[PDB]
Ligand binder design. Structure first.
Ligand SMILES: COc1cc(N)ccc1C(=O)N[C@H]1CCC(=O)NC1=O
Ligand SMILES: [Zn+2]
Length: 104
């Protein structure tokens, strides 16, 4: 039911907050460095630190700009916050294998 940071246990999100963007909460993507991510979209998340200002470059999600989202506790890269778009205006794309799932 709750997702925590796999490295340190910081409280991050909830299964209840999964968001099906374009029909699926799961999206498999690669960046310009060829890294493949299995990204789960969430309407809401907490315990992150968003670093820098948003960028639209190479955005996986049409009409959204991204900011890097670290674990606010341990600084591990957990995904991205997306903003600037429509319906919803914002959401989080978190890297599923960087989270741990477990009880409330
Ligand atoms: C400018 O993107 C990068 C450049 C690099 N040299 C290395 C990595 C990234 C990177 O992971 N970009 C991601 C951000 C999220 C997004 O939606 N799409 C991406 O492609
Ligand atoms: Zn952490």
């Amino acid at each position: 039911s709750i997702f925590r940071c796999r490295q340190c246990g910081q409280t991050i999100s909830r299964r209840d907050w999964l968001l099906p963007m374009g029909g699926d909460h799961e999206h498999v993507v690669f960046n310009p460095a060829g890294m493949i991510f299995r990204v789960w979209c969430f309407s809401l998340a907490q315990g992150l630190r968003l670093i820098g200002a948003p960028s639209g470059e190479f955005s996986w999600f049409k009409g959204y700009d991204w900011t890097i989202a670290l674990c606010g506790q341990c600084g591990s890269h957990l995904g991205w916050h997306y903003e600037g778009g429509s319906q919803p205006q914002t959401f989080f794309g978190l890297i599923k294998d960087r989270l741990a799932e477990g009880p409330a």
